[PDB]
């Protein structure tokens, strides 16, 4: 049937659809998923909020907004998860406390070659603002833009990644801190905890 | 009261908030919007579609996703947008044959500073697939990509936005053409017409 390998143990191959954490035989649309089962246990998908997941294989940046399900036992990376009818559709990668991503298509993504540049990831705290590389309060923010605002951009050498409740950020910068790019995702999401 | 400024006639100011082709004293979420009305006519926006919407002032990308109403009227740049409630909440900005944009806080949005780069907007036909800076049938894609995998990536010159009516992706391509960095939104848009 379909096949599904864990990226932390090796099993990235290039010629296979890859998702946060998995290469596998098959390319699923884990979006319409509501209840999954893993070891003929059931659990809910949580509904409007998600996880940002990613895995870094070869000098290839992997990462999306993935559906998580609520699930109190601990699970493993690899563990089996089925659909209600029997079908392997993904296998356990990334956790959050109780929150487990599903892996697959997903919402929204970011795919990046990785060579020359960093990426980081942050959780974004409720009411603060973004600029460049770091996160504060508004007001605070709008005078480090204020004091970068002058500069002449440099080229870009790192991705940040911005999770929070209601929005989700993608910023590019220089090698001062400058802002070059800002993409925003109108999603909320959490990060995996390792 | 709330002021709204257009882009097209000089009305950028870049200490007022910045949205696709207007510039406020205020900052509305239009997302909440079901229903608009111009001029005491009552417009539907439309539901899961979009308008991908840019602005271009100094040196300045603005681009969002906006929610959009359908009206067979012919509207002009800067006509007044209420809601059922006679307040104003954004003025006309950009218009796709009888699909009007409503400009404000809207989706997925892009602010990039066009330093030493350039951005260019594309239809994206439904089933067809994209490699940097071009798309075409999956199968003449997936050949490209294989002669592209090669090249060593080099720095960001070109931005490409591609807008599909299920789909919106962002692609970044260096010198020679090579694919750098995709962003994908799970939404689907047109393009405003000139």
Known sequence: MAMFYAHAFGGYDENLHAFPGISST???DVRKYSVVSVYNKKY????????????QVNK????????????????????????????????????????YALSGIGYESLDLC?????????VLETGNAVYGKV????????????????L??????????????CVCQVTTVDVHGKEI????????AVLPIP
């Open 135 to 150: 996160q504060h309060e508004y007001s605070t923010i709008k005078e480090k833009a204020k004091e970068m605002n002058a």
């Open 114 to 122: 990785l060579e020359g540049v960093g990426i980081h990831h942050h």
């Open 26 to 28: 098959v390319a699923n």
């Open 44 to 55: 809910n998908i949580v509904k409007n909020k998600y996880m940002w997941c990613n895995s």
């Open 181 to 188: 790019m800002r993409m925003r995702f109108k999603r909320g």
């Open 60 to 99: 290839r940046y992997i990462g999306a907004l993935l559906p998580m399900f609520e699930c109190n036992e601990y699970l493993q990376i690899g563990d089996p998860i089925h659909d209600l009818e029997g079908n392997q559709i993904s296998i356990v990668t990334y956790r959050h406390k109780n929150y």
């Open 152 to 165: 002449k951009p440099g080229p870009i050498i790192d991705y940040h990644v911005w999770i929070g409740d």
